[PDB]
Amino acid sequence: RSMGNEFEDYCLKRELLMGIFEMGWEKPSPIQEESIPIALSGRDILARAKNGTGKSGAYLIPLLERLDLKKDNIQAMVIVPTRELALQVSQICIQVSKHMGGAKVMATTGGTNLRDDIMRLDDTVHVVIATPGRILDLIKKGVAKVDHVQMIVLDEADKLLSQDFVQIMEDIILTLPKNRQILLYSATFPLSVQKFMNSHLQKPYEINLMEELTLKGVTQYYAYVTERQKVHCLNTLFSRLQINQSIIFCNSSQRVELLAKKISQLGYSCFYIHAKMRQEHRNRVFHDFRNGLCRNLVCTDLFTRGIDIQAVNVVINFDFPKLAETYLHRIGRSGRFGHLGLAINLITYDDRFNLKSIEEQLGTEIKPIPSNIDKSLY
Amino acid sequence: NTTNIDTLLVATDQTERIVEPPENIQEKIAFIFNNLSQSNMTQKVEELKETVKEEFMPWVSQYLVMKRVSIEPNFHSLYSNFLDTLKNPEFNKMVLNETYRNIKVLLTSDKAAANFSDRSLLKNLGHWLGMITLAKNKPILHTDLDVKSLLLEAYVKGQQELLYVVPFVAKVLESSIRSVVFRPPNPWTMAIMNVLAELHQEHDLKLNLKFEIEVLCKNLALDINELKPGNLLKDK
Ligand SMILES: [Mg+2]
Ligand SMILES: [Mg+2]
Ligand SMILES: [Mg+2]
């Protein structure tokens, strides 16, 4: 129930509004505009929302608003399935709450050291952001005392309630006070999530808060090029466009490598990511890229986080995909970081039927590359 | 788009046409700036010298300021480090003047027919300006940009003008904390701060502008309460 189109209308603490302002969040997004006042009333929430940190704002804001900083007790918990997501969510939570004067936020996962987290919990922590196994362990050892937890967030509940974690999640909930507010966010709602809902959520407010992927806003081109001329065509593009950061998609892990090697030697600034890499390394590359240590990332369709990189304004399909859905995942955006400016498809003659099929299935338009870029291939 | 630079493009298409380098040079310049990183800067800078003649440098300053810096705030440190590495003090001056020029195009543009992006373009150029003047111990001369009067003129014009100008001024002044010459309690800096502190006392200034000023203070390690607001607005 929207209280209005401005953060100021929600009667949040001034210190919290300042944190929101400094994030660059000028106006509440639609997911925030609905999620926030319901959460502030105390209702349980069951929300459909896409994977990742885009929606962290929607729950961190009422979470921080509800903290009593004069109490030295854990008061709120965010459960996430991976260590990476816990680091991201905690970083955001720390930045959002930096003006509140004393809000203690802590991330604890299999990635962080157990002994060290124990030591840390000797001091005041108000908000814990954790992976399920770790937080259940701390609760069971009496290190995380949770008898004052009045709010718990389950972020990506479908993954939290899969066979790997569903019993651990059950164990956690049962240690919390019975009246605790539960806010659940998930991309899908399989049987496991429905079961948890009926057992634990008290007459939840249910909202579909998913921003679908649109091609609106993105100018899409295609250029017919033989396999022999693709790199040369690529060189033209990087001599004619204004590229802040770009993502270059190839169709296999092998081709990503070979391409990255070739263009690295041509003076390009790039890193590459693909499937045959340990996740820790993938995470390291993504962090570096998001931090601007290189200008272009070469990758397969396994990299889904390009969405979380604001500076990416150009995507290149070095290899054209076979499926409309694959194309939409590569080029589509939700609009929260806005839309990409530009998508460019390098297509061989044999890609034409797919180009046409995909354009039509997506109800979009992919124009030929303009003349003054097409020249200079020659 | 959120990076529409038409307002800058149009204003340029009505200025003294300068010498455009050949396409192969233009392309080489775009490639360099597209692929510039901290780990190839030395190599890229050297490439830049070995390829661009002295007579094209005006074009390059126009390219860098209008087409890159105005919409790539995330790479401001990189281009600034690029200038330091280039060691071309006469190029730096062209970039400075191009920065002042585009800033004025924005400041004086009709705010009603403005693109959504123009506010961002202004903020970004202000951030850059602060980086190539104040942060490097060079003054912002009032004959180029009189910041204090800008604030006063904005306050006369109304909330819309304040919404453009105040975040511009804040982005500029952010760099002053990195300057031995211009860091507080430098008199030029504090006079601007004192005017901002006075705006901050206006009951009906939009909350987000009040936050711009308070966050500016925090960045300059200034106690907002320790500022000395005058009565410059009480005439208006
Ligand atoms: Mg993990
Ligand atoms: Mg992980
Ligand atoms: Mg873990």
From Swiss-Prot, chain A:
| Motif window: Q motif | 5-33
Quick one: effect of changing residue 300 to P? In IDDILF; decreased P-body assembly
Entry protein name: Probable ATP-dependent RNA helicase DDX6
- Reported tissue expression: Abundantly expressed in most tissues.
Q: Which residues of the full protein are shown?
A: 95 to 469 of 483
Q: How does it assemble?
A: (Microbial infection) Interacts with rotavirus A non-structural protein 2; this interaction probably plays a role in the sequestration of DDX6 in viral factories. Interacts with rotavirus A non-structural protein 5; this interaction probably plays a role in its sequestration in viral factories. Interacts with LSM14A, LSM14B, EIF4ENIF1/4E-T, PATL1, EDC3 and EDC4. Forms a complex with DCP1A, DCP2, EDC3 and EDC4/HEDLS. Interacts with LIMD1, WTIP and AJUBA. Interacts with APOBEC3G in an RNA-dependent manner. Interacts with RC3H1. Interacts with ATXN2L. Interacts with MCRIP1. Interacts with MCRIP2. Interacts with NUFIP2. Interacts with TRIM71 (via NHL repeats) in an RNA-dependent manner. Interacts with GIGYF1 and GIGYF2.
According to the entry, every stretch annotated as the Helicase ATP-binding domain falls at 36-207
Its biological function?
Answer: Essential for the formation of P-bodies, cytosolic membrane-less ribonucleoprotein granules involved in RNA metabolism through the coordinated storage of mRNAs encoding regulatory functions. Plays a role in P-bodies to coordinate the storage of translationally inactive mRNAs in the cytoplasm and prevent their degradation. In the process of mRNA degradation, plays a role in mRNA decapping. Blocks autophagy in nutrient-rich conditions by repressing the expression of ATG-related genes through degradation of their transcripts.
* Consequence recorded when altering residue 262 to A: In LK-AA; abolishes interaction with PATL1 and reduces interaction with GIGYF1, GIGYF2, EDC3, EIF4ENIF1 and LSM14A. In 4xmut; abolishes interaction with EDC3
Q: Which gene encodes it?
A: DDX6
Curated annotation (Swiss-Prot), chain B:
| Name listed for the protein in its UniProt record | CCR4-NOT transcription complex subunit 1
Its organism's taxonomic lineage begins at: Eukaryota, Metazoa, Chordata, Craniata, Vertebrata
Impact of mutating residue 19 to L? In VIBOS; uncertain significance
Impact after mutating residue 138 to E: Impairs interaction with CNOT7
Q: Which family does it belong to?
A: Belongs to the CNOT1 family.
Question: What sections of the protein cross the membrane?
Answer: none
Q: Quick one: effect of changing residue 139 to Y?
A: Abolishes interaction with CNOT7
Q: Which tissues does it occur in?
A: Strongly expressed in brain, heart, thymus, spleen, kidney, liver, placenta and lung. Weakly expressed in skeletal muscle and colon.
Localization per Swiss-Prot or TrEMBL: Cytoplasm, P-body; Nucleus
Record function comment: Scaffolding component of the CCR4-NOT complex which is one of the major cellular mRNA deadenylases and is linked to various cellular processes including bulk mRNA degradation, miRNA-mediated repression, translational repression during translational initiation and general transcription regulation. Additional complex functions may be a consequence of its influence on mRNA expression. Its scaffolding function implies its interaction with the catalytic complex module and diverse RNA-binding proteins mediating the complex recruitment to selected mRNA 3'UTRs.
How does the entry describe the domains?
Answer: Contains Leu-Xaa-Xaa-Leu-Leu (LXXLL) motifs, a motif known to be important for the association with nuclear receptors.
